[PDB]
Specification:
Layout: E1 3-9, E2 17-23, E3 28-35, E4 41-43, E5 68-78, E6 84-96, E7 99-112, H1 114-117, E8 124-127, H2 144-148, E9 156-160, E10 167-171, E11 184-187, E12 196-204, E13 210-218, E14 225-227, H3 229-236, E15 243-245, E16 250-254, E17 262-266, E18 269-273, E19 279-282, E20 289-292, E21 294-296, E22 303-305, H4 307-310, E23 314-318, E24 324-328
Parallel strand pairs: 3-8, 4-7, 13-22, 14-21
Antiparallel strand pairs: 1-2, 1-10, 2-3, 2-6, 4-8, 5-6, 6-7, 9-10, 9-23, 11-24, 12-13, 12-17, 14-22, 15-16, 16-20, 17-18, 19-20, 23-24
């Protein structure tokens, strides 16, 4: 089997991407944030505290003839941006782009933090990291990909995120028309439950490539590119007027600037992030100070190849017995 679904930016800045997901019988379609940095599929639901729902579409298990309460199971998750959610668990039928899993754990939110409430466009998350990170207790549950894997034509999914445009998540096949050149594959460590890999270095603009190992995660659920402070300082030093602002919470730059590209290494291959991808717009409405898309990972504890990086590539998440990651230009 295979699946193919379009993923769409939630706003003009590509702050996140939503993908429609069918849950239950008859289908209830929710727009979920596919997140390769976490491993829970959770949804706004009929059980979510009413004051914490503001425009989202909810899953109502009682209206699904295939929903079954997973007795005794609870979940609770906190994300890197400080947001959180928790609740109980059902199993139900879940389909993405024509690919159907029966008996998928659908985590129903009883509580969500303010950032989720305030984002009306995201109805939940669909985790695509390794199932060892799944938070369901006392019986850990498998991700959608893990459940689908054996049925897929090939045990892979691909992320093809757009810049200010829709893109695609595919399951079970590699669309050879979706990228240019070749796919370069690189080793993955699953030791922390992530799609963790080591970039071979970077360049800023038309500058020389610096060969240096950068361990980090491929994370579709993170907006920006978070890299070591040395790398980030080297980038922003090429933008007149750019500075790190403690009050804003990162590097900002004059909105009048033309940003240089940023290149990262995948083995001997190179992925180029155009300068425009690094512009996240005014820090507040009307400001001439703009927020940067490359930020320091210092104090996160991990480097994160988020959407800013991933959207410059066609990315293969290879879930073979020894997982690997593949990157191609497009």
């Amino acid at each position: 089997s295979t699946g193919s679904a379009t993923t769409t930016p939630i706003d003009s800045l590509d702050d996140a991407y939503i993908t429609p997901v069918q849950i239950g019988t008859p289908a209830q379609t929710l727009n979920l944030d596919f997140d390769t940095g976490s491993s829970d599929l959770w949804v706004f639901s009929s059980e979510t505290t009413a004051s914490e729902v503001d425009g989202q579409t909810i899953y109502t298990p009682s209206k699904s003839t295939t929903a079954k309460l997973l007795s005794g199971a609870t979940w609770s998750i906190s994300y890197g941006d400080g947001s959180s959610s928790s609740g109980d668990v059902y199993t139900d039928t879940v389909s993405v782009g024509g690919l159907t899993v029966t008996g998928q754990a659908v985590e129903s939110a009883k509580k969500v933090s303010s950032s989720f409430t305030e984002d009306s466009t995201i109805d939940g998350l669909l985790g695509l990291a390794f199932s060892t990170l799944n938070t369901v207790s006392p019986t850990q549950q498998k991700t959608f990909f893990d459940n689908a894997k054996a049925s897929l034509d090939s045990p892979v999914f691909t992320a093809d995120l757009g810049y200010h445009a829709p893109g695609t998540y595919n399951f079970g096949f590699i669309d050879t028309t979706a990228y240019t050149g070749s796919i370069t594959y690189t080793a993955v460590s699953t030791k922390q439950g992530f799609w963790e890999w080591t970039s071979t270095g970077y360049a800023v603009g038309s500058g020389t490539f610096k060969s240096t190992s950068i361990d980090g995660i491929a994370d579709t659920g993170t907006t920006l590119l978070y890299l070591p402070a040395t790398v980030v300082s080297a980038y922003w030093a090429q933008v007149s007027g750019a500075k790190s602002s403690s009050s804003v919470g990162g590097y900002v730059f004059p909105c009048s600037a033309t940003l240089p590209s940023f290149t990262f290494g995948v083995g001997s291959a190179r992925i180029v992030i155009p300068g425009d991808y690094i512009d996240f717009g005014p820090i507040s409405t009307g400001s001439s100070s703009c927020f940067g898309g490359i930020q320091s990972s210092a104090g996160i504890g991990i480097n994160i190849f988020g959407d800013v990086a991933l959207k410059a590539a066609f990315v293969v998440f290879n879930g073979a017995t020894t997982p690997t990651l593949g990157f191609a230009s497009k």
